[PDB]
Design a protein around this ligand. Structure first.
Ligand code: A1L59
Ligand code: A1L59
Ligand code: CO
Ligand code: CO
Ligand code: CO
Ligand code: CO
Lengths: 396, 381
């Protein structure tokens, strides 16, 4: 945590493009995720689009783009994602269940970002192709069975997602306010070699970094590093467990139940996460996502000190009604809530956030939003535990 | 009504689906059908074998079960390798059709003795519960479950109940019929009738169908087969092709107000719920305004029109009907929402009951659909 930014990207990583989850049936996860996140179906490539290889359904809420893909029974030239391996998809679901297979970035050229990546260490995974329309697809391995997909497309274009995908516009479809992906975090057994591997090939630089003296629940804990693209728009953190602890990490609990490295959580950022949260919790009771237990009152009594200078009492009283966590950085405020495990295993979960502050000006006096404004809520580990404990003593 | 049941076949207990992840289908089916989570059996209940979630709307009981990564299994038939293959081979599909029986062990021994291929040897789940399985068709088992009348565990032993406040139903009251698609009808029916003593309710000859039923005609197990030497393509062969063999084609879920139910179901369509087939052409409804004007108001038929409900009649009773689009990724499994009007006939002590099958199964509508489609296309040049 020097916080420098050497702009060392080896390829132009413009933005997150989508995230592809694999499973045995895409209809069902897509279904739930739509209702739960307010990310209605925006595109499909199934049998009805002439694709006999895979069934791909795509949820969108603004920039947020959750792709769900699954194999049909048993062609192959009908695939719209030609990286797709039925054999490998089947394995993935058997090994993990609901989990993220790919993390896609939009880049300048897919061919180039690969070549530069592979040349700077990256393990290949899918050899660049032209999907027509001037769309490029290329994949390198990131951690474990998770791949880093590259996607390039002329700025105008047609196929809004990928060639072969037929758009979808249900009327009655409403989003809940999720604007963008913020960060995509991977649990790994040992951090150093993984961190090196990626920065090695992407040219991403360290943005932040927390070890675990009081950054890990109880005896166990985690060692987190954050890797950032030049613009600090794309953030790929990594957790590892702290070794030789007395109790077991949840980063280890993940690794065990998941059967390897993989994406632990994805943070979905909103411009009114409170408003978003209301919609999301209304669905909780009928098949949406359920959230972690609300912090006890003491927590908030504390956020009235920490962040009362920048949050109104009407805001904080709402943050409390909705179990939202609060954290400050050098110059900003992070609102933060975590879902319960989203699939069957205590593995993957989602993070809903809002970033308040850090808006700087350029060389002509134009305001931009500094990414990572508010940090990632490292304080809430420590601050939950002590309030959770102080609560219980308050009960004799 | 032969009355040949070889075991005590009380009622449908549940239908169990195998996927790679129960959370997701159980979460979706929940708000698509209005069937709130009613019971779980997973890590948080000490089961590390498998993850089961039970949706319940009245008597409708949808169980979703998925393997994890020993003695901890709540359903001790579960085999993880089987599930792995099931999901891989079918996607989302019904694995188990469960009947409530008097003893289960007895149901098994009787059944097996009368031809049934064994699947799971009788267990005692505890709390007076009995569980056994035999082969129905394909991978699909017929699961016997037996409990004491009151009992404890609402579902099965090892299952913590669930009651989120703000849960709702959309009126679905029970399972009406569970239809299986097979390649050849004659052998399958022979086998099922052979071991259950279910009798033929009726027989269609699209597809060729038979409806095996229990003594009370409360449990209905239809069976279709594709038409041999077919000129076109059968929706049953399609099924058989994309699904990779015999399996449950659809399940009809009955409602006391199918039209109110439907309203609720259709509002969820846009945000991830089920979508229903295209509505029939205007002619269709002028047709029902003829064949069924005497039993349905002019205001009722107009709601059927709004919502795409189909109508049919039998000797003495009316059928409302609406099918869902394939509920999975594959064009295989779908679901029927139906209401049965009439046929509440008396016994010999006075006590009238609702007779099963009231309104038939909508078979007629097959032709009426096709004919109204043709007609409507002509009048549009
Ligand atoms: C880098 C980077 N990106 N995000 C992060 N950190 C988190 O997401 C994070 C922050 C705070 C907390 C909490 F306050 F609640 F303890 N987190 C948790 C909670 S937990 O462990 O499920 C819990 C069940 C122990 N998970 N991730 C985070 O670091
Ligand atoms: C036995 C037994 N139990 N139920 C039945 N019949 C049906 O469910 C059934 C009735 C009517 C119709 C329809 F009106 F639309 F033609 N069905 C359909 C239509 S379909 O094929 O999806 C169509 C999309 C090819 N599927 N099952 C039925 O038979
Ligand atoms: Co580039
Ligand atoms: Co986070
Ligand atoms: Co019996
Ligand atoms: Co039917």
């Amino acid at each position: 945590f020097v916080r420098a930014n050497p702009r060392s990207d080896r390829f132009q990583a413009l933005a997150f493009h989508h995230v592809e989850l694999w499973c045995a049936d895409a209809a069902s996860a897509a279904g739930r995720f739509a209702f739960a996140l307010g990310a209605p179906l925006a595109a499909r490539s199934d049998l009805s689009t002439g694709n006999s290889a895979h069934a791909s359904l795509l949820l969108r809420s603004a920039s947020v783009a959750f792709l769900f893909t699954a194999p049909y029974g048993g062609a192959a030239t009908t695939a719209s994602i030609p990286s797709f391996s039925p054999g490998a998809a089947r394995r993935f679901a058997a090994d993990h269940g609901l989990a993220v297979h790919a993390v896609a970035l939009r880049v300048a050229d897919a061919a180039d970002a690969f070549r530069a990546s592979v040349a700077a260490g990256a393990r290949p995974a899918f050899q660049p192709a032209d999907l027509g329309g001037g769309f490029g697809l290329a994949e390198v391995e990131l951690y474990g069975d998770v791949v880093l997909r590259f996607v390039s497309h002329p700025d105008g274009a047609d196929a809004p997602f990928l060639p072969g995908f037929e758009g979808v516009s249900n009327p009655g479809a409403v989003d809940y306010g999720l604007r963008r992906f913020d960060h995509v975090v991977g649990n790994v057994p040992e951090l150093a070699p993984v961190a090196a591997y990626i920065s090695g090939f992407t040219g991403f630089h360290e943005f932040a970094e927390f070890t675990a003296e009081d950054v890990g629940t109880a005896e166990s804990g985690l060692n987190s590093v954050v890797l950032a693209n030049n613009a600090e728009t794309v953030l790929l953190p990594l957790n590892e467990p702290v070794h030789g602890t007395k109790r077991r990490s949840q980063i280890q609990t993940y690794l065990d139940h998941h059967g390897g490295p993989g994406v632990q959580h994805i943070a979905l950022a909103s411009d009114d996460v409170l408003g978003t949260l209301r919609e999301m919790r209304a669905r909780s009771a009928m098949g949406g996502f359920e959230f972690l237990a609300p912090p006890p009152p003491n927590y908030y009594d504390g956020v009235r000190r920490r962040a009362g200078d920048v949050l109104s009492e009407e805001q904080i009283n709402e943050c409390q009604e909705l179990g939202v966590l609060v954290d400050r950085d050098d110059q900003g405020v992070l609102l933060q809530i975590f879902t319960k495990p989203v699939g069957d295993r205590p593995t993957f979960f989602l993070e809903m956030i809002q970033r308040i502050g850090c808006m700087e000006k350029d060389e002509s006096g134009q305001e931009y939003q500094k990414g990572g404004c508010g940090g990632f809520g490292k304080g809430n580990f420590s601050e939950l535990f002590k309030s959770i404990e102080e609560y219980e003593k308050s009960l004799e």
